[PDB]
């Protein structure tokens, strides 16, 4: 062991995790890479759970919640989200982690704070700015999973196409809509589906917002 | 006692409700029906392809209604709530969901039914196909979250995330201080109705002229 810290340990874990995925991450695996005994490891970071939280928190430094600006709101919200997504893309299995874990931690609440600022900044009231953030982050995760599981795109490529084949060759009299919509369902264009989900939620917010009429 | 795939999955779902997903091995299920891996793998295939059918059998509890003059936005919600009750009446069912497509026979009927309703409001091809997809995710996510509160059939932990957040330095964390309640604890029935409205209105803006 060289000078071990709760940061060199984490930067190490993540290293393995990109490389090889969630299940290859174990305590014994980790302590191996770093050239140390279980003592030093369990000291800074604990069992496997705690470790994933620390892993989660550190990569978060990557996202950016911009400071509120004169009439850029909608875009400033898209920026923010599109930023968070770019994060999930680089790092294997990170979304899997996110589903059953608290959005807590240094980065975790320096992040909520700036998320709440910007939203409330849209002339949005309490309950709606609170929940709103939940829904966005919820929205962007799900998406990131969806993409997570898409050679590369050859297995998905043909599956999608064989799905697209069955749909159109379905009978028209009993299935007018699905015959009509075989593309827009099987479309494996995540980029544009993503900008859509955003357009929608956001307008749902703005509309939600100034309801006081 | 003629064994059939429908009988197989009524037992696999009967133990899933009564004991819990994590305990549904192929092993267990086989014992219950007093039958070998032979006859069980003969229909349903393996643990994973079996789930698909379990999911596809229960989706029968969802009732997408026939489109009616003036009431579009209303009809959508009824559909959205009925899905949510399905997830509410069987444990772990969401966990499964967030891994699988509704390519099942059952699944396909309601995709047609749903998309018909959505396209009745003035939703151009695209809007409507993702409108649906979008709505699916939201209701799925919610129920996973609801199930995590442990009800149906913890509020100790949450209350302790309220104290904690409220107790931050007020100047460095004003927004987090002021929103302590609505973030930590929130009635589940309230959080659903909000997102439903949000998205529906969101899709409505999408329709335009
Ligand atoms: C790291 C932190 O700051 C960076 C920028 C910086 O300051 O360096 C940007 C950022 C930071 C940050 O901490 C952050 C968040 O914590 C959240 C966020 C806030 C939340 O309140 C939540 C979630 C969130 O992602 C969830 O993913 C989820 C939930 C609830 C659960 C529900 C379930 O258990 O199934 O689902 C997912 C895991 C949630 O409540 C959403 C966000 O968009 C962000 C951010 O954008
Ligand atoms: C069974 C079928 O018919 C009944 C009506 C009847 O039987 O008379 C009603 C109904 C039926 C039906 O099949 C149905 C659906 O298939 C869907 C649906 C449509 C979809 O397009 C999807 C999902 C869906 O549940 C997902 O759960 C999911 C995805 C994709 C993934 C992505 C992820 O979250 O990681 O998430 C889950 C697995 C999805 O695309 C959403 C729905 O609201 C419905 C329905 O309401």
Automatic annotation (TrEMBL), chain A:
Q: Which keywords fit this entry according to its UniProt record?
A: DNA-binding, Repressor, Transcription, Transcription regulation
Q: Is Oxidoreductase one of the keywords?
A: no
Q: Which residues bind DNA?
A: 26-45
GO MF annotation list: DNA-binding transcription factor activity; transcription cis-regulatory region binding
The residues that cross the membrane are: none
Repressor keyword on record: yes
Q: Report domain HTH tetR-type positions.
A: 3-63
The biological processes this protein is annotated with in GO are: negative regulation of DNA-templated transcription; response to antibiotic
- Report what the protein is called: ActII protein
Species the sequence originates in: Streptomyces coelicolor
